[PDB]
Amino acid sequence: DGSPQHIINEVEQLLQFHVATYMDNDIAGQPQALQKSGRPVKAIRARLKGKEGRLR
Amino acid sequence: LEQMQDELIQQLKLQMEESAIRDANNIEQGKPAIFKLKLLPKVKDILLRANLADSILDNNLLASVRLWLEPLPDASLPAYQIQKVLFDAIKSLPIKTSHLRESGLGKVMVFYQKSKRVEPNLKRTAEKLISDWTRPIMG
Amino acid sequence: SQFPYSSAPLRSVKEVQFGLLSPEEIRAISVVKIEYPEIMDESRQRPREGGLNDPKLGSIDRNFKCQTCGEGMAECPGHFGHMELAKPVFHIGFIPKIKKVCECICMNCGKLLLDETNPTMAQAIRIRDPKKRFNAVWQLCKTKMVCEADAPVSRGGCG
Amino acid sequence: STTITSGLKYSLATGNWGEQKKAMSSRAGVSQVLNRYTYSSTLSHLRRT
Amino acid sequence: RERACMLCGIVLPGRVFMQNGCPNCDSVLNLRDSDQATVNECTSSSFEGLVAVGDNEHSWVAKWLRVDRFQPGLYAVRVDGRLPSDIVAALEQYGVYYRPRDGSVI
Amino acid sequence: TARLYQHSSKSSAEYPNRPQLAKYCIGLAKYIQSPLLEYLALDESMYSLHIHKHQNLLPREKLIDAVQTSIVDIVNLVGVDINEAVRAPYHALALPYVCGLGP
Amino acid sequence: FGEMERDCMIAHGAAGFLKERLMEASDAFRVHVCGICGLMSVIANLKKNQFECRSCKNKTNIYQLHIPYAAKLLFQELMAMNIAPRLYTERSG
Amino acid sequence: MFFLKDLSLILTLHPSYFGPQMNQYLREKLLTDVEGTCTGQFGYIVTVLDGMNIDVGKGRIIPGSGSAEFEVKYRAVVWKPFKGEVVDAIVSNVSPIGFFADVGPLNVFVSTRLIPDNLVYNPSNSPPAYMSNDELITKGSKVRLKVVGTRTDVNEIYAIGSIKEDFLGAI
Amino acid sequence: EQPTSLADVFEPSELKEKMLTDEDNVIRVTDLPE
Amino acid sequence: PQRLLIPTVDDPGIWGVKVRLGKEKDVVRQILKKKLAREGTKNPLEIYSAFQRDSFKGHVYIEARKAEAINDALKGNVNVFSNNSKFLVGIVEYKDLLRPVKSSDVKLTRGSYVRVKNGKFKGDLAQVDEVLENGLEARLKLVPRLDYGFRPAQRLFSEAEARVHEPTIRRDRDGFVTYGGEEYYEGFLYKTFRLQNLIVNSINPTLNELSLFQSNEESTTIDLSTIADSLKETAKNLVSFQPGDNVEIINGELNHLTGTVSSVNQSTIVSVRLHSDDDTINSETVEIPTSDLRKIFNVGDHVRVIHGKHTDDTGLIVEVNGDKVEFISNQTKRTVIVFSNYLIKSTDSTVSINESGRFELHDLVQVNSDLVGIVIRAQKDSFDVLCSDGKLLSLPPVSIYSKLNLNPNQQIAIDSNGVEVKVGDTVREFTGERRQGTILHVYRNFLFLRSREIVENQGVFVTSSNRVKTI
Amino acid sequence: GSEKVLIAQERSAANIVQVFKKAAPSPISHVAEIRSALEKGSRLISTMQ
Ligand SMILES: [Zn+2]
Ligand SMILES: [Zn+2]
Ligand SMILES: [Zn+2]
Ligand SMILES: [Zn+2]
Q1: Which residues of J touch I11 (CB under 8 A)?
Q2: Which of C34, C82, C89 to mutate to test the interface with A (most CBs of A within 10 A)?
Q3: Is E22 annotated as a binding-site member?
Q4: CA–CA dist G3, G18 (Å, integer)
Q5: Which of J:170-199 have CB within 8 Å of B?
Q6: How many CB atoms are located within 10 Å of the residue E61 CB?
Q7: Domains and CATH numbers, chain G
Q8: What are the sequence ranges of the domains in chain E?
Q9: Residue J413's closest CA among J389, J390, J442?
Q10: CATH number of the domain at E2-103, please?
Q11: I need a labelling partner for H67 at 20 to 30 A (CA). Which of A44, F1, G36, J196 fits?
């Protein structure tokens, strides 16, 4: 439709953030993705680690 | 050092003009344009080298660039690889008003901007480059 | 004997080969393209085709069979779909490795900053383990901060 | 009137001492279910720190 | 309820256009002296891009929108609908050229 | 014909908000009103009716030709109203089977 | 049957009991793998007796495995993260 | 076209057959399960050479199921058609949509669109045939056709022939 | 950039089903029982 | 002019400020009111213009020269967020911020055929008889959906039936009839519909509706320009490519060249390796736009129909008549002529018949009043049935009577010795081939045995209960 | 309908100076700490080191 570079940068950075947090929600140095209930999103990486993860 | 680069760039200019003539004849003879594609890798390698930009501008290779970008009389546009490589090279070099005056590439740029068979990304890049080149004239 | 008969021969895993998934392979192994954000068609059962709950992806309901393999819930393993991204994005798990690779090569000609002429570089290439090989090559090429369009004769660089 | 009512009721019901939307990082376990197994257990629970 | 005058691009309530007319286009449109059909044909309630202009003389936007010679106020970037053929001919009689703001013409 | 009509999509288009048993009863009623038109409504499924004990021994083309000849003979013995056929396609099903005419 | 019990069973040397505990007395599952790509992308239809891997376009070089359902889930979650674990039934050296 | 190939088969034996006659029983089981089968990868296996002296090796006991698994290697005669190959045939049926011929175990269907136009199908002829002025191809007639396409099924192969080029048709 | 035949508009099977082909016009014009 | 007005370095700057969603126009009006009120005062609002765009949500753009002017304009407003979220717009963006939108089509054309988004005629094709000058609504020509006393099927308004079922019809002209408050002109409804009720692009026409609309024009589908444009759109959008596809080039300097797709990037750039008599040319890969590629279909290749009435039908290419390609089908085993645009070279069919018809595999159905059979293979268009006699038949799903639902109290089998045998048990033939298998269905004295050893009809064979013994 | 008990929470006293010895791997050897709290409300306000 129309390409203000500032808007493009904002929206593409949002897409990058969503894709990154879909696979890893413990990225140090930035806030986590939160659910509507306030709990952090259980990313795929969190599924595999810990005592209760997939492997253990 | 740099006299030699000018000689090599002039040789490249002659090769590019000869390849364009050969491809135009081949299209007129019922054969596809292949010589431009054959010469494309060497032209790309030369253009990607930044330190040769000054020698390119001193030999006015943009004239041959425009000749390649000029659509052939059969109303057939050049190969998309050639257009993309030439657009990238044009972006990669500091083109000034004097160089445009020497080459007259603005006419072909406007044609690309107005045309519709051209890729929309190339259309946007042509608009951007035309605006950038009009910038120094008005201030 | 608890599994329904299948004519394919039964064998056991002997090797697990890792690697990344090429976009071509992702498109090839997919069975449907996901494009509509709405999960439900009209909130009247029958989830929207082409959405995140496409029936071709697999079945998790007892009375519904998978539309791709035709097997029941107890037998359908699930089938993948693919989503085309408008602009490429970084994989969050590979950003440090991407940075290292960017440091190891030239950003214009796409070639290594060092060649086998250097005895240390040839020694590093001689090693076998890919991880240690990459570590040594990065330790060497990190120091080299300029691409060479000429041999340190043209080495293929852009200068 | 729902703000204070719901906040107090939630904090006393769940034990998370804070706002509902800030459940993480809040001090949990402040409020507990009274132990009524026997009289001594109730008396002990009411005097616990 | 607000409508955008097609010719000058100003946006004012439709009842305001009917009762008082366009303060800028009244020299060529006579919107106040025009019936509801002509008001609709020159003022459209379907538009986009509300624009507020403070100083027509020095605002580059006003020059870009060709509203630097008009009254400051509410203006629309894009207006749905074009002037009718008869009104176009009437304006061409006056010697004034009409450039559509519908965006389809550029 | 009723059993075949309860499964035909023609009934579903005709009656989108009716049960299958309603379609079956409607087919029975239409058969009582006019067996010939109901037999015509079968279109292609009429060839699957149990007509003769050894109906499957004949080639498909020969059986189809026999059915066509029988139905043309019967409909020409009956006669077709052109005005009603124009008014309603259901009565117009019999138009192609008239002699000289065709689909 | 946690990890320490698994270590005790390893110390006893009873491999059959360990395999039975972790497969038959738990989530056992059957999958089909392509003999070429090595992925679990075979679209197997047992009733029609036809197997087919679209990516490799083969109908013959296909095997079936008995793996824990949790292993299948782990491999699918790995594939969700662009990692491709390929299972092969023969060694290569 | 016929070939000699070295093939291998995996044979599973139930423990109830663990007797002195195990080897011969495996041999007849292999013969019954291979002779006459049709595999799309290889085609048709017609015979197994040296069928009574095939080595079976040592069977491996499958852990947890008791049954032994045997790896049997053998040499067999295999026939498989190829795209663009011209072979002899015998017509088996004549139909308006085309005629069906037989090339050994394979049955080949040739459509009218791959038949020369002068060979107009004659249904009045006894038996009905695709005939021309000098050519008449009916049931039982020798025909030379070129296989154009092959269709792979579960355990069947479907081939399409043509007689529209030179040196084809009736022979 | 700038350029009716019903053959290109719809599939020939659909056209034959809907009776919109040259055989159809010949049959309709012809003075003979179908 | 228009080109000369492009911005310069000395032109006033443009700032963008984030605001609360939905309050952008309110902030614009507040800014204008503040500027007017402070105009002519000692400290007027030193700005030039301010605006916003609907697409760029949450942003308000002000043209000024100083940041203090922006702060003064934003001072006293509540929609501005706490932080000074202001940024300097790049001069190149100045043209883009005010460029128009929705310029794809000039206008809705009267006489065009369109689809309806919602309403009682949701999805019905409609001709645009009239376009209202407002552009929000338009009068359309539709096929009425009436019952005359969940929607009735579309049908031309019949005045006689309407009067019989409702004698309150009105008349206003000749050929223009108003019934029940709805205006029907010569059997076609004419009703105004809003622009938000229409789809003016990607319109899919059907020859049935086209004939029903054009019959009153004394010629079948006389108008075919918009239809031809729709055909071009359908042909262009339906093309999808995969690596290894043999394609031909229509335009460019490389026109009339063959090549194989090597890799696919996005959906508009395709890397192709060309094939030619010169070896040095065959070793080059060229990226070519998809708009100038046509698929090459060679005779004798497995191809699957992408879209149309024959969707999911496969076969082998037989005749290549340019745009239209002919292939012998696999299921119907008959030649079908479909455009090359609807075919993909798929070497394997593996067609799934689920979610189609009423019957699945291994279903005991009644062929007719006399013949009862079982399903051996299902098709997208028909079914294959093995009957109790031992023969095979092909019939459409409609022709089949119904599934023979039998309770265990009805599906009972007794062997030769008299011992009851139930469903799924294994029995062996007493004589003959002496085969064995698992019972699939029991009907009268007929048993449907299936065995994995038998390949014919997927191992299904009918054998009488009197000739088998329990295993 | 459920009986909840508030468990008393133990905290360090405010308005008192606490002097601590930091560990060796640090430029700091000793720290003087104080946390302030207004008398009215007894709420923590600020900390100083
Ligand atoms: Zn499935
Ligand atoms: Zn370089
Ligand atoms: Zn005005
Ligand atoms: Zn594979």
Answers
A1: 308-310, 337-339, 342
A2: C89
A3: yes
A4: 11
A5: none
A6: 29
A7: 1-81 (3.90.1800.10)
A8: 2-103
A9: J442
A10: 3.30.40.210
A11: G36
